[PDB]
Amino acid sequence: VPHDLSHLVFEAGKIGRLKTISWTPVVAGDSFECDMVGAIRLSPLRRGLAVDSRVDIFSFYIPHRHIYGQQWINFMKDGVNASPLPPVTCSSGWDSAAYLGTIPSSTLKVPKFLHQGYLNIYNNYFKPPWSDDLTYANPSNMPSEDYKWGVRVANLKSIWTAPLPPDTRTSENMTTGTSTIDIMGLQAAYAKLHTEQERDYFMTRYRDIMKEFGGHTSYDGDNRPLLLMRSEFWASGYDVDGTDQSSLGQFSGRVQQTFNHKVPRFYVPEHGVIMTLAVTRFPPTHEMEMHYLVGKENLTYTDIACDPALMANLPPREVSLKEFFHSSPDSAKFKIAEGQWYRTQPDRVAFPYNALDGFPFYSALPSTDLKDRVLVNTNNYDEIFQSMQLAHWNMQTKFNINVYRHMPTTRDSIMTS
């Protein structure tokens, strides 16, 4: 029978960090549907609105088996006298499970499926794909801010914000004879590099190298949380006009955004949790990014002509944060696709701006390091807001859930009978 598991949510977090806003434990065989409707607000910013932030709300299903593996299987089999499922440990702070959208129990411990569940959802859909998994054991092992506000999500695809995989080959040797090459061996050489290149660029995931075989893999083959629903939108608001002697001609942008998310009814195969997370981000607009062709001094035929034959046939080009940013070290490199500068265009911000707080732009220079300079650098948004004890953004939503089960009943459980 319909079980109304509705509840209110009073949220808040940083800019480019994934954070759990709601979770509902589900049992095997029940149908789950939710209607999440609220408003998203940003902290008051220092001037008028200039650029809308984009918001992504995700609802996933992670069965317990996925989390406890064989331990869970045995638990279900063993039944009533199964050994209790050991929760996970947390860090000394009421805001020490935040990322799990839950208050750490009185003993500072929490469900592993809440932890691993979360871990599994990031390492499978947010973490850059050449990147290493968050193999955190317990929330007491994750960085303070990773578990306060959540781990950093990736910046919105730019030219410099989506470099080619760093382990990307720029050459490939075939050991040849001293005065002869094997015309047939060469052929083969190319076949192998192909298979390698594909794995590097597109199939870094099993489920991915499979799909290109024309097959399919159940979220049960690779233990990946199942993405049930996804909502995306741009949050906006209005400016407030100051009207006293001193702040007459001054404004403060107020971002109030009504949003809604609908998770269509869903059949829960096994017992598990449904995680609903939010992520607020701004387009990667840096105040000092230059057009590659304008930042790289001598222009050769290969750079300026856009000869099809050329672009379509040479290795990825290794560039530095220096051919894209005005002061940046010659030393911080990344691999780009030849002619990439012709498939795109950076946003452009006049110098008059780079000295102004209140603009949701990237002031600072990138981060020499690949990873870090891709997964967004949240902190470079601290200067955009006024005062804030409600982080960068806060949310007030009413999670209207409806679960259809085969439950006892309230009176038949308390009725020894």
């Binding site: 050449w130 995989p165 794995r199």
Partner: peptide, 12 residues
């Protein structure tokens, strides 16, 4: 138009 960004899969 056609794809551009290639990380080695899907990045949200």
């Amino acid at each position: 138009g056609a794809r551009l960004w290639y990380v080695g899969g899907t990045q949200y």
